[PDB]
């Protein structure tokens, strides 16, 4: 999964698809945080 | 940056009083010293906490973590 | 005004955010008019050459006369930059620091 940079539209991209937004057509794409929260210990 | 919850020196709590403190300044048009003493802030360290606070949370809030320029 | 042409050949105005994030260079383009003239004279030995106007290429009447000459960097907030006339809400939506 990913997310747009202007409108923050929800997008899914493959390993070959162009790195663009479908609605706004921008070239800046952000990831999405790990949906499953993972517990950790600081060592 | 939101108001500190506790006083760094005497352990007291000042976090909840910020909203009510802002009320006295323009609704009642009081001065700063009397407003500070109206809320039980008597040691000058608590007065230091409330008096010299820069509230930066109202500027980040008009903004998004995506696309700042330079 | 500053703008960028991608590898695909598409042209879009460049803004400081994209230059910062994408490692671009904030700059614009320069256009200069060029005119050409050809003179021809009969080289008679012992006499001064007298050239006469024959051909003059000047495309001032068409947009093709503007010869592209290069790209010039732009300093922020100067006259050309988009930031010059931006209000506080304009700076926020473009995400400037006021």
Swiss-Prot record, chain A:
It is found in: Nucleus, Nucleolus; Peroxisome. Zn(2+) binds at residues 4, 7, 21, 24. Keywords: DNA-directed RNA polymerase, Metal-binding, Nucleus, Peroxisome, Ribosome biogenesis, Transcription, Zinc, Zinc-finger. Signal peptide: none annotated. A zinc finger (C4-type) spans 4-24. It comes from the Eukaryota. GO terms for cellular component: cytoplasm; nucleolus; nucleoplasm; nucleus; peroxisome; RNA polymerase I complex; RNA polymerase II, core complex; RNA polymerase III complex. The N-terminus is blocked. Coiled coil: none annotated. Present with 907 molecules/cell in log phase SD medium. Component of the RNA polymerase I (Pol I), RNA polymerase II (Pol II) and RNA polymerase III (Pol III) complexes. Component of the RNA polymerase I (Pol I) complex consisting of 14 subunits: RPA135, RPA190, RPC40, RPA14, RPB5, RPO26, RPA43, RPB8, RPA12, RPB10, RPC19, RPC10, RPA49 and RPA34. The complex is composed of a horseshoe-shaped core containing ten subunits (RPA135, RPA190, RPB5, RPO26, RPB8, RPB10, RPC10, RPA12, RPC19 and RPC40) where RPA135 and RPA190 form the DNA-binding cleft. Belongs to the archaeal Rpo12/eukaryotic RPC10 RNA polymerase subunit family. DNA-dependent RNA polymerases catalyze the transcription of DNA into RNA using the four ribonucleoside triphosphates as substrates. Common component of RNA polymerases I, II and III which synthesize ribosomal RNA precursors, mRNA precursors and many functional non-coding RNAs, and a small RNAs, such as 5S rRNA and tRNAs, respectively. RNA polymerases are composed of mobile elements that move relative to each other. In Pol II, the core element with the central large cleft comprises RPB3, RBP10, RPB11, RPB12 and regions of RPB1 and RPB2 forming the active center. This is DNA-directed RNA polymerases I, II, and III subunit RPABC4. The lineage of its organism: Eukaryota, Fungi, Dikarya, Ascomycota, Saccharomycotina.
Swiss-Prot record, chain B:
Zn(2+) binds at residues 7, 10, 45-46. GO terms for biological process: nucleolar large rRNA transcription by RNA polymerase I; ribosome biogenesis; RNA-templated transcription; termination of RNA polymerase I transcription; termination of RNA polymerase III transcription; transcription by RNA polymerase I; transcription by RNA polymerase II; transcription by RNA polymerase III. Disulfide bonds: none annotated. InterPro entries: RNA_pol_su_RPB10 (IPR023580), RNA_pol_suN_Zn-BS (IPR020789), RPABC5/Rpb10 (IPR000268). There is a cross-link at residue 59 (Glycyl lysine isopeptide (Lys-Gly) (interchain with G-Cter in ubiquitin)). It comes from the Eukaryota. Gene3D superfamilies: Homeodomain-like (1.10.10.60). Keywords: DNA-directed RNA polymerase, Isopeptide bond, Metal-binding, Nucleus, Ribosome biogenesis, Transcription, Ubl conjugation, Zinc. GO terms for molecular function: DNA binding; DNA-directed RNA polymerase activity; zinc ion binding. SUPFAM superfamilies: RNA polymerase subunit RPB10. Pfam families: RNA_pol_N. Component of the RNA polymerase I (Pol I), RNA polymerase II (Pol II) and RNA polymerase III (Pol III) complexes. Component of the RNA polymerase I (Pol I) complex consisting of 14 subunits: RPA135, RPA190, RPC40, RPA14, RPB5, RPO26, RPA43, RPB8, RPA12, RPB10, RPC19, RPC10, RPA49 and RPA34. The complex is composed of a horseshoe-shaped core containing ten subunits (RPA135, RPA190, RPB5, RPO26, RPB8, RPB10, RPC10, RPA12, RPC19 and RPC40) where RPA135 and RPA190 form the DNA-binding cleft. NCBIfam families: PRK04016.1 (NF003089). Belongs to the archaeal Rpo10/eukaryotic RPB10 RNA polymerase subunit family. Present with 5300 molecules/cell in log phase SD medium. This is DNA-directed RNA polymerases I, II, and III subunit RPABC5. It comes from Saccharomyces cerevisiae (strain ATCC 204508 / S288c) (Baker's yeast).
Swiss-Prot record, chain C:
Disulfide bonds: none annotated. Coiled coil: none annotated. It is found in: Nucleus. The binding of ribonucleoside triphosphate to the RNA polymerase II transcribing complex probably involves a two-step mechanism. The initial binding seems to occur at the entry (E) site and involves a magnesium ion coordinated by three conserved aspartate residues of the two largest RNA Pol II subunits. DNA-dependent RNA polymerase catalyzes the transcription of DNA into RNA using the four ribonucleoside triphosphates as substrates. Second largest component of RNA polymerases II which synthesizes mRNA precursors and many functional non-coding RNAs. Proposed to contribute to the polymerase catalytic activity and forms the polymerase active center together with the largest subunit. Pol II is the central component of the basal RNA polymerase II transcription machinery. Component of the RNA polymerase II (Pol II) complex consisting of 12 subunits. Belongs to the RNA polymerase beta chain family. This is DNA-directed RNA polymerase II subunit RPB2. It comes from Saccharomyces cerevisiae (strain ATCC 204508 / S288c).
